[PDB]
Write an enzyme that holds these catalytic residues in place. Sequence first.
Site, PDB file in Angstrom:
ATOM      1  N   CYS A   1      35.872  38.086  36.291  1.00 40.50           N
ATOM      2  CA  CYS A   1      37.001  38.778  36.851  1.00 40.50           C
ATOM      3  C   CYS A   1      38.004  37.780  37.396  1.00 40.50           C
ATOM      4  CB  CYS A   1      36.467  39.725  37.963  1.00 40.50           C
ATOM      5  SG  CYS A   1      37.809  40.671  38.739  1.00 40.50           S
TER       6      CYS A   1
ATOM      7  N   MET B   1      32.448  36.485  41.092  1.00 39.40           N
ATOM      8  CA  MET B   1      32.358  37.678  40.212  1.00 39.40           C
ATOM      9  C   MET B   1      32.425  37.213  38.738  1.00 39.40           C
ATOM     10  SD  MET B   1      34.265  41.215  40.529  1.00 39.40           S
ATOM     11  CE  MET B   1      34.009  42.629  39.420  1.00 39.40           C
TER      12      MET B   1
ATOM     13  N   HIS C   1      38.833  37.424  41.213  1.00 36.78           N
ATOM     14  CA  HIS C   1      37.645  37.276  42.050  1.00 36.78           C
ATOM     15  C   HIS C   1      36.641  36.247  41.524  1.00 36.78           C
ATOM     16  CE1 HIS C   1      39.223  40.433  44.345  1.00 36.78           C
ATOM     17  NE2 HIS C   1      39.011  41.358  43.433  1.00 36.78           N
TER      18      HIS C   1
ATOM     19  N   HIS D   1      40.355  44.966  39.310  1.00 34.52           N
ATOM     20  CA  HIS D   1      39.455  44.086  38.616  1.00 34.52           C
ATOM     21  C   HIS D   1      39.995  43.933  37.170  1.00 34.52           C
ATOM     22  CE1 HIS D   1      36.373  43.771  41.702  1.00 34.52           C
ATOM     23  NE2 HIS D   1      36.034  45.030  41.602  1.00 34.52           N
TER      24      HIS D   1
END
Length: 99
Positions: free
Chosen positions: A84, A92, A87, A37
Amino acid sequence: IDVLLGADDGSLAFVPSEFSISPGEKIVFKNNAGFPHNIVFDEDSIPSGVDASKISMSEEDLLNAKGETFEVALSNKGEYSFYCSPHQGAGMVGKVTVN
């Protein structure tokens, strides 16, 4: 405030994803699940005059291991969108308000 990167069921989310802080309050982003991440602030979506570079990871930077953190303190008031990068399309994404 602590924010998980990844929910405990493996969902690709910040927990919490929307929250308010005071100026110079630290945020600790903690690698939890579905890593690697990172945390990027949207340079188009932060208070005017703020240097995104001072508060964000690079798109190319990652936290690769469970429990790695990135800590930041925001001082300017206003709304800050972050995501992120690997993602983002999964949703996210988050928003913090400094009030």
